[PDB]
Amino acid sequence: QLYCDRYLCDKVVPGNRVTIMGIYSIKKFGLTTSRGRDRVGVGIRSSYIRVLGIQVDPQEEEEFRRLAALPNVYEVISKSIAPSIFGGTDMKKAIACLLFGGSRKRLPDGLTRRGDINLLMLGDPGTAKSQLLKFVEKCSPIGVYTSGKGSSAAGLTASVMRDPSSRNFIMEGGAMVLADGGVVCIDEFDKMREDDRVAIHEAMEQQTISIAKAGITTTLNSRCSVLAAANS
Amino acid sequence: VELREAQRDYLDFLDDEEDQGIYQSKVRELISDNQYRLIVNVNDLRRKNEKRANRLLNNAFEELVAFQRALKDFVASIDATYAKQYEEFYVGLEGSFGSKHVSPRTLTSCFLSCVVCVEGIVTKCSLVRPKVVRSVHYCPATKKTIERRYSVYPTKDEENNPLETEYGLSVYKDHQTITIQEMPEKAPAGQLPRSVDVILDDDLVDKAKPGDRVQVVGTYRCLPGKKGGYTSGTFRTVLIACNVKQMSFSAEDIAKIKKFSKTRSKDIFDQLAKSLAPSIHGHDYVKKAILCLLLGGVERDLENGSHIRGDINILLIGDPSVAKSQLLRYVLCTAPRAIPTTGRGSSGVGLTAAVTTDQETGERRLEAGAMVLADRGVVCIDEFDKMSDMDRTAIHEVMEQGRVTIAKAGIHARLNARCSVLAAANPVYGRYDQYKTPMENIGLQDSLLSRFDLLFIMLDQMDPEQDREISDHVLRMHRYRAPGEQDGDAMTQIYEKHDNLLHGTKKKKEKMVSAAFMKKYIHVAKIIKPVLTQESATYIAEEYSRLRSQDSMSSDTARTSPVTARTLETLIRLATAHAKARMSKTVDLQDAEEAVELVQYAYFKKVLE
Amino acid sequence: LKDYALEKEKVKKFLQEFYQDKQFKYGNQLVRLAHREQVALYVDLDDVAEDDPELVDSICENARRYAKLFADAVQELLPQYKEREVVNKDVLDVYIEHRLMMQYPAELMRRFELYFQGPSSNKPRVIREVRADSVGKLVTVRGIVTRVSEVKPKMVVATYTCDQCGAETYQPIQSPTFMPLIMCPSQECQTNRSGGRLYLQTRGSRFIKFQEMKMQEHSDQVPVGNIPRSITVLVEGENTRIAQPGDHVSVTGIFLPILLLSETYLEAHRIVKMLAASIAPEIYGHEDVKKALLLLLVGGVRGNINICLMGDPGVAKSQLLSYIDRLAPRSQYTTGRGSSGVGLTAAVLRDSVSGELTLEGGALVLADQGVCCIDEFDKMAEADRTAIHEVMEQQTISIAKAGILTTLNA
DNA sequence: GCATGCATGCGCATGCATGCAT
DNA sequence: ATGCATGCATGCGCATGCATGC
Numbered sequence A: 001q002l003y004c005d006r007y008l009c010d011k012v013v014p015g016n017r018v019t020i021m022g023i024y025s026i027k028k029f030g031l032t033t034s035r036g037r038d039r040v041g042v043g044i045r046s047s048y049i050r051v052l053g054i055q056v057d058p059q060e061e062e063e064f065r066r067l068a069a070l071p072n073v074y075e076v077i078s079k080s081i082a083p084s085i086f087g088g089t090d091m092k093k094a095i096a097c098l099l100f101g102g103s104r105k106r107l108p109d110g111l112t113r114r115g116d117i118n119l120l121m122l123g124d125p126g127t128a129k130s131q132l133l134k135f136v137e138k139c140s141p142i143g144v145y146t147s148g149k150g151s152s153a154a155g156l157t158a159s160v161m162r163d164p165s166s167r168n169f170i171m172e173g174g175a176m177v178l179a180d181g182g183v184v185c186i187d188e189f190d191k192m193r194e195d196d197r198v199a200i201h202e203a204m205e206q207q208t209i210s211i212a213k214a215g216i217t218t219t220l221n222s223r224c225s226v227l228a229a230a231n232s
Numbered sequence B: 001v002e003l004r005e006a007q008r009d010y011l012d013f014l015d016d017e018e019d020q021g022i023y024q025s026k027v028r029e030l031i032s033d034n035q036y037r038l039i040v041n042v043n044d045l046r047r048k049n050e051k052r053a054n055r056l057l058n059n060a061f062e063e064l065v066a067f068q069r070a071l072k073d074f075v076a077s078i079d080a081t082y083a084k085q086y087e088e089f090y091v092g093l094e095g096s097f098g099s100k101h102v103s104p105r106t107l108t109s110c111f112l113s114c115v116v117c118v119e120g121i122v123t124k125c126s127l128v129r130p131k132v133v134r135s136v137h138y139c140p141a142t143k144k145t146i147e148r149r150y151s152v153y154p155t156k157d158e159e160n161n162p163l164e165t166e167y168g169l170s171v172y173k174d175h176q177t178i179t180i181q182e183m184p185e186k187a188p189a190g191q192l193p194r195s196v197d198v199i200l201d202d203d204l205v206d207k208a209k210p211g212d213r214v215q216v217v218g219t220y221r222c223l224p225g226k227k228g229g230y231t232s233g234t235f236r237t238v239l240i241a242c243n244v245k246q247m248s249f250s251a252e253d254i255a256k257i258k259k260f261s262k263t264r265s266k267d268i269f270d271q272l273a274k275s276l277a278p279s280i281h282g283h284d285y286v287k288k289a290i291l292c293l294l295l296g297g298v299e300r301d302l303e304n305g306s307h308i309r310g311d312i313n314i315l316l317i318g319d320p321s322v323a324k325s326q327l328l329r330y331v332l333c334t335a336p337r338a339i340p341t342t343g344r345g346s347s348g349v350g351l352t353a354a355v356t357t358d359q360e361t362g363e364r365r366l367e368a369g370a371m372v373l374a375d376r377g378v379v380c381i382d383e384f385d386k387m388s389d390m391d392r393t394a395i396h397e398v399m400e401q402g403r404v405t406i407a408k409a410g411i412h413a414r415l416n417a418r419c420s421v422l423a424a425a426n427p428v429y430g431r432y433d434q435y436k437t438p439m440e441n442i443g444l445q446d447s448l449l450s451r452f453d454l455l456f457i458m459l460d461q462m463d464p465e466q467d468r469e470i471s472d473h474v475l476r477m478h479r480y481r482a483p484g485e486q487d488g489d490a491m492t493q494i495y496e497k498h499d500n501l502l503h504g505t506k507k508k509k510e511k512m513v514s515a516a517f518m519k520k521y522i523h524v525a526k527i528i529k530p531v532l533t534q535e536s537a538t539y540i541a542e543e544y545s546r547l548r549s550q551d552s553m554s555s556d557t558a559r560t561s562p563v564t565a566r567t568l569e570t571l572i573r574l575a576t577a578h579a580k581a582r583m584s585k586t587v588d589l590q591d592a593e594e595a596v597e598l599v600q601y602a603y604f605k606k607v608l609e
Numbered sequence C: 001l002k003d004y005a006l007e008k009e010k011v012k013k014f015l016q017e018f019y020q021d022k023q024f025k026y027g028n029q030l031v032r033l034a035h036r037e038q039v040a041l042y043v044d045l046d047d048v049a050e051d052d053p054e055l056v057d058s059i060c061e062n063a064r065r066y067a068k069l070f071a072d073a074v075q076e077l078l079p080q081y082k083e084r085e086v087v088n089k090d091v092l093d094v095y096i097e098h099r100l101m102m103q104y105p106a107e108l109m110r111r112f113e114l115y116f117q118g119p120s121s122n123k124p125r126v127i128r129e130v131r132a133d134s135v136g137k138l139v140t141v142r143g144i145v146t147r148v149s150e151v152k153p154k155m156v157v158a159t160y161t162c163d164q165c166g167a168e169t170y171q172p173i174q175s176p177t178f179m180p181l182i183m184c185p186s187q188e189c190q191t192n193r194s195g196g197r198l199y200l201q202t203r204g205s206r207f208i209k210f211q212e213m214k215m216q217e218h219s220d221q222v223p224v225g226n227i228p229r230s231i232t233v234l235v236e237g238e239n240t241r242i243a244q245p246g247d248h249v250s251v252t253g254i255f256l257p258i259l260l261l262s263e264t265y266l267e268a269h270r271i272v273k274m275l276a277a278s279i280a281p282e283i284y285g286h287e288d289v290k291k292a293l294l295l296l297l298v299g300g301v302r303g304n305i306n307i308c309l310m311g312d313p314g315v316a317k318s319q320l321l322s323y324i325d326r327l328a329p330r331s332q333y334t335t336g337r338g339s340s341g342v343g344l345t346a347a348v349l350r351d352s353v354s355g356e357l358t359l360e361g362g363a364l365v366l367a368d369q370g371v372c373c374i375d376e377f378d379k380m381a382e383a384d385r386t387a388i389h390e391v392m393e394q395q396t397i398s399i400a401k402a403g404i405l406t407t408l409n410a
Numbered sequence D: 001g002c003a004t005g006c007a008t009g010c011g012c013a014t015g016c017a018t019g020c021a022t
Numbered sequence E: 001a002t003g004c005a006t007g008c009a010t011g012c013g014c015a016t017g018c019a020t021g022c
């Protein structure tokens, strides 16, 4: 158990791998007689650690301007995309322009138009499709990789529940929700479930997901570029 | 000394009648309306006195007490007669706080004893409870009355004589507690939400309900550790509200509305339908139907308690990429109470209110559904074909009479569901087959179609001229950039200003209506209650008879929906809506002719070989 | 402030000088109350309007005090109108006679209850709008009853007998919970300092019927997008056994809290219930479809009748069912799966008073000796259809599941 | 036509915290 | 002054109802 004070609060999100330096101490709340069913333990005080340090596991502008000002930026970027994979120059260029992406535009009427690109790939097994998806996931600043049916311990789309104890609306971040402005790679496009398949239509079209349950109606934002692979 | 100076400054703030002030008129209105709460803009106070505003923001309780005292003195000076009823008045706050605009996630101890503004959703509410202010007791043995004030309950006299309580002579005030949770649309993904507790007193008790988005301005304070020889050193923080607002009218635009109506008259409906959505090209009949939904019909109740529906329902079917979802989103944006519910997004338990047994008290309570919340509103259903049959059966009752009947042993109720429905669905074959009859393509039961009022079929005909016009419009809209924004940057008049890209050189002869003026006019028209005339009734009846007898005059064309008794009500409702479109009092012939033309267009379609 | 003696005298003279109704009603009522031929008396505030109207406002503001004053005045007036002894006297009357033959609390010797009826000029309120401003006042509420508790006795005055003396000790009860006495406060025991211990007596003690009920708002008065609210009403005296679940009632009562937050409740004073083939004249045609409904409403001499109407959509079958539901005194209307399963038959639920389990019936149970209406019959579940068939053929429902083993009459 | 997956009420016991009647 | 009954989660075991998939 860890105790953080003052400015150390909210520096760590649950799930992070951390190295913490602190003081090993015990709780002090006076004295009290042992209670409960078990009274074998005598003179035992609960212990904790008081946290004191946490570690979580302008010049570049000119460099980027020089890189983009060349006449051969397109070829350099295309070659930079997966040099290990033989061939597929057009596919690499398409992947690069997908990574850069377009621009979204609003209108006075309030309607919005999509600014992200979606791609589909079909082919026989052994054409190195998963490798491209992994390279895109690693290269993109924000990237998610799924198997179509969700993942080991996370679904493809968000879900909403209500905690009976606290009566609060808890939302589980799905694969699409966890990415905002990034790239979502989807292998095995054929094996999608019905509800996820229905939701992905709205996710691709309006980049939003609408969920309505007892006493709640919400519209979450999912501005995700989609890169998909499927088999014959 | 400081409190007296603050009171003097607050008193000086209110006396603005000789300085173009409005607060005196506000106080007069409050006295007229029997209200004892005044809302003061923080921005105006900061403009007039920055030091007082800073002191109030950094120190709330003392400054608020001083301001309440100043308001008491001011109301006394105006009419001491009114001030006798209430002991003290209460203060409301409004404006832009800036750094103190704090979300539930960002609340910290740095804002203690300050005034903060929060925006959130309500999740927990408590029953209204009375709280004692003063107590009066009487002694039958000695015929003596005693008074106590609260800010120990006596039971016996000095000579141990019993005391009897006078409940009527006592003073009680309302009290309630609510919970506010951070909106999921703004909370980081994958993280648990955080909540705040708010206390409501006096007239603010019944201004919030669970599942609603509110904005609350109030003071932030700690609760002292309760009695005990040992303390843990941790205090609970609870917000004390002073103003609650439901997040969502002018004065001189009435003249503009009257002039526009008295001028255009007949052209009002055509202009409103034309300017519904510039971003979408074509589909005039669909826009007219959407405008009719926005206006709506007239609900009628009679002596026997019978109810006649006044809402309209429209179902759109067509090929992909014909701008149906765009229309649904536009209706969602424009309509005041609009709720989107996709096919498999919500089930029958979500669309319809349910019963849950409360573990705290052992009772059974009702939780409202999606359609229950949208009373006198619009519900949009995309991917309507994917919806299960049971959900359609549940929706049937709302579409028929707009009411929901619920009963689980120990409780039974009927809730109002007077709403309107937009539905978007795809053909069974993916794309609309021209040769096959509409019955095979739609693939829906006759009852569901009959309960719908209008059916529209949209086709993506690849005509070169239509394609050229659509491409022109789409690229003109895409090339547009908002004025005042630098090129390459990343991310009220009745008639809208002409734009070279949004409208075009040819469209200079005509103009589109502004959104705000359109909303105001729609609201005013919805207020109006038209009356049907005798001339139109016979015409409508004869045309209904002609429509029913058209079975022998249909030629090679087929009918999209069966013609039943509900079609006559649909005709009358569309006529009433079109009469509402232009501010009038009676139904005319052209009013029924428009609805007849709409029915002619909607109900019959040619079949290609 | 004002002296209560003058107002008590005014009440006494009002109870004796209201001939303007021609027979003296209050004289007869007092005679019946004195001869134990009547156990309840109701006072009309509209009748008081002939006298000074200030009394009406005072009662509307401090109802309990004036109720006690009226009770005391009636008790004092009772001896004057007595003419004869009790013809047939019960156990309590025997105790009263023996005690008089040989201070006693006023309510112990008292054997009548008084109630107030709200003025007709007083407009009925809404359950949502009763708040702290109405605490301690007299209000009128219209609603629908949803839950009713069983009748049980409740103590009023407790009687204790000493271990070493014949003296009887009396203790009034004005709280939901009370502390029993131990030592004997009798003068004999006080002088001798014997320290005898008291014992409770059930025969000498006084009990009154007690009942709980709940009310809900009408669907018409519910605001936009809200849910009907519920209120709790306490029933005592002869008002017991009047209200039943599913009935539309109007109750006149007092708004009182319970112990600086508090919980509120209502104390009831008056509870009230709210060719010929012209069924639904709004619907054209169907001349031969309306006599069948009339015969269904009339019924046979088992003589029950069941009717089913199958039709194409748009011929307005639902409106006829709604009209039948509205016309019948005891009626229930079902739309579909919104009242399936537990909605019909019955379920077991906790009690508010006893703290144990009791059976609450569904729509079919409420519609006993009435008419039930079902819409979209083909869409019902198999279990519901079997239950409906059982009701039609046998008129009783048999339930045998974990914790439930019952046969309900329908 | 039925067994099973997924909520949800029911009844219960068990553990942790605290607040004061004898 | 001190030890205990109670309010508030939480696991346990169970039955019951709604949806669907072969």
Ligand SMILES: Nc1ncnc2c1ncn2[C@@H]1O[C@H](COP(=O)(O)OP(=O)(O)O)[C@@H](O)[C@H]1O
Residues within 6 Å of the ligand: A084, A085, A086, A087, A124, A125, A126, A127, A128, A129, A130, A131
């Ligand atoms: N054109 C290629 N250049 C280099 N390696 C390749 C190429 N095609 C296939 N491979 C190799 O073969 C393997 C293909 O497996 P994988 O990419 O998972 O197939 P798929 O994605 O189609 O299921 C990869 O590990 C990759 O190293």
Ligand SMILES: Nc1ncnc2c1ncn2[C@@H]1O[C@H](COP(=O)(O)OP(=O)(O)O)[C@@H](O)[C@H]1O
Residues within 6 Å of the ligand: A113, A205, B279, B280, B281, B282, B319, B320, B321, B322, B323, B324, B325, B326, B470, B473, B474
């Ligand atoms: N008539 C039209 N005018 C302008 N844009 C159109 C038109 N028809 C289609 N579009 C464009 O094509 C896209 C269609 O997507 P969407 O509205 O989701 O189609 P649907 O609702 O039929 O599934 C929209 O983004 C819209 O900008």
Ligand SMILES: Nc1ncnc2c1ncn2[C@@H]1O[C@H](COP(=O)(O)OP(=O)(O)O)[C@@H](O)[C@H]1O
Residues within 6 Å of the ligand: B308, B309, B400, B565, B566, C282, C283, C284, C285, C312, C313, C314, C315, C316, C317, C318, C319
């Ligand atoms: N014979 C008739 N006379 C008058 N109105 C009718 C008649 N038949 C149908 N209607 C109208 O048509 C509508 C039918 O709706 P509804 O009662 O829900 O039909 P159903 O009960 O068959 O589902 C009603 O609102 C009613 O006003």
Ligand SMILES: [Mg+2]
Residues within 6 Å of the ligand: A129, A130, A187
């Ligand atoms: Mg692969």
Ligand SMILES: [Mg+2]
Residues within 6 Å of the ligand: A205, B321, B324, B325, B326
């Ligand atoms: Mg669409």
Ligand SMILES: [Mg+2]
Residues within 6 Å of the ligand: B400, C316, C317, C318, C319
């Ligand atoms: Mg019907």
Ligand SMILES: [Zn+2]
Residues within 6 Å of the ligand: C162, C163, C164, C165, C166, C167, C184, C185, C186, C189, C196
């Ligand atoms: Zn004794």
